[PDB]
Amino acid sequence: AKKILVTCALPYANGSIHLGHMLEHIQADVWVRYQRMRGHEVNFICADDAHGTPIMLKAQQLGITPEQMIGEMSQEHQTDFAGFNISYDNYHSTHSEENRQLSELIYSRLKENGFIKNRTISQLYDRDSEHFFFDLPSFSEMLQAWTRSGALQEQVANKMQEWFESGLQQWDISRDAPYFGFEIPNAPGKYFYVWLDAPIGYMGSFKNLCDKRGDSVSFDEYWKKDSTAELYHFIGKDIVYFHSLFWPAMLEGSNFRKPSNLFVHGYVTVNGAKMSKSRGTFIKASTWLNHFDADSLRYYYTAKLSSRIDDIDLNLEDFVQRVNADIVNKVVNLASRNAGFINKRFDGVLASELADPQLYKTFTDAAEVIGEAWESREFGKAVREIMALADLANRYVDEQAPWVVAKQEGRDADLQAICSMGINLFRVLMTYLKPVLPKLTERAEAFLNTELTWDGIQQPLLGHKVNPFKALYNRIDMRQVEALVEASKEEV
């Protein structure tokens, strides 16, 4: 039972959440849900990145104060994430008292530890000015040892080299008023650059969670230098520099633990290209939900995700085909083709023994490889394994052919045994997919009259009453895709 703290990058409070953002949150949520299923203590945290000149000026435009804009954006963002069932334990803000205090705490520890430097510069002004710099170069060797301690992704362990080929430099962490952010203590008119306080927002968000829980020990247990808890950050490749260099260094110099690992993913493309507004492929999370459910996109992204930083393509044509073929035709089909005979002919009661014990064992035997696949973030591998098992289950059902055994008077016991077998195979499959399809899983659990646990598959449902269900998952069609695209064009 490990203690794990997982985060997703903090979305900027200056735009709506789109399908690109959703790849990140969905990848993280699936991993998080899997970890909870295995019994670990998990804390999934996020928050809006609310500081920076851009935001300050955007607020001025709309005639709304930044405080007002970020407040509205925060609600919009959380409504969308909740719509995709992203299970955060806390969603906070970089513009909070918790983050203000932690930013000052870290800065003061850095300055006192001698990692903060001063200087002057020239810049366009609507001119000189003093600035504060973080002495990154002093943590190089430490970063080296940390970087090579068999942890980060190969493509990431490398990449940084191209950055070393340019040498680490002191980082300008201060900005002048007017600026929407935190004021630097003992330095009037100076503010912390957004990127300095942003990652501290991870800490601010957890502190908020602990404070709300009345938990006065967890914060330190997770962030103290000798913590045995694991810290993971899910991020895109465009912000790896901040998370692999500045961030670890800031923590090291302020007597805090560094991330256990960074899980970097690639960009989402639609129909093979970057999202395009004119083509209606720049899709908002809110818009997606007007047309499709969350499970469909969660499934599609998961079937294509891996432990690498490669781009993920949402091919709209392929989307409809994949969802109907896998979810409806393979998994859900296993339940619907068998539940009828059970509910109608046997009052919903499943057989008292497994018809084919060998087949069931083949299914539960796969838990190890599938669980390891979720754990290692090889989602595509996990899905292929699960769908391969599903093919086996549908083959079993065909060989046994219940639709024929049913019309043969005197074969009741045989029918119940066959159809119950299929229902139990379905139980196992939905357990492996539980991290991926939250809503379909709830519908399956209501039908099975059972909550699905990872260890529970070792005990099949016997002499057990199932409930009649009304379509667990309906097929989708290209006309809905066309409508989604058309709507997205019309929005911009």
Ligand X SMILES: CSCC[C@H](N)COP(=O)(O)OC[C@H]1O[C@@H](N2C=NC3=C(N)NC=NC32)[C@H](O)[C@@H]1O
* 272 burial via Cβ count (<10 Å: 0-12, 13-18, 19+): exposed
Residue 238 sits in the site that holds ligand X (CB under 6 A):
yes
SS3 333: helix
DSSP character for 465? B
Residue (of 391, 327, 401) closest to 359 by Cα position: 391
For residue 144 the two structure tokens come to: 């080296």
C-alpha–C-alpha distance, residues 340 and 102, integer Å:
59
Measured at the CA of 319, the angle between CA 314 and CA 324, to 5 degrees, comes to 160
x/- site string to ligand X, residues 325 to 364, per CB under 6 A?
Answer: ----------------------------------------
Residue 283 sits in the site that holds ligand X (CB under 6 A):
no
Q: Which is nearer to ligand X, 10 or 294 (CB)?
A: 10
Q: Which uninterrupted H or E stretch holds 48?
A: strand 41-48
The residue number whose beta carbon is nearest to ligand X equals 236
Q: Which is nearer to ligand X, 276 or 449 (CB)?
A: 276
Q: Which is nearer to ligand X, 241 or 267 (CB)?
A: 267
Q: Which is nearer to ligand X, 195 or 346 (CB)?
A: 195
CB of 55 to ligand X, least distance (A): 10
Q: Which is nearer to ligand X, 24 or 76 (CB)?
A: 24
Identify residues 3-62 at the interface with ligand X (CB under 6 A).
Answer: 9-12, 20-21, 23-24, 49
Identify residues 391-430 at the interface with ligand X (CB under 6 A).
Answer: none
Region of 172-180, 195-203, 220-228, 360-368 interacting with ligand X (CB under 6 A):
195-203
C-alpha–C-alpha distance, residues 203 and 102, integer Å:
7
CB of 459 to ligand X, least distance (A): 40
Strands 90-93 and 41-48: parallel
Region of 167 (left: φ > 0; alpha: ψ -120 to 50; beta: rest) is left
Residue 18: what are its φ and ψ, rounded to 5°? -120, 180
Q: Which is nearer to ligand X, 273 or 388 (CB)?
A: 273
Are 29 and 21 spatial neighbours (Cβ–Cβ below 8 Å)? Answer: no
Number of residues counted as binding ligand X (CB under 6 A): 18
CB of 51 to ligand X, least distance (A): 9
190 is in an annotated binding site: no
C-alpha–C-alpha distance, residues 171 and 385, integer Å:
46
Residue 241 sits in the site that holds ligand X (CB under 6 A):
no
Residues placed in the known binding site: 277
Q: Which residues does the annotation place in the binding site for ATP?
A: 277
Residues that bind ligand X (CB under 6 A): 9-12, 20-21, 23-24, 49, 198-199, 201, 235-236, 238-239, 267-268
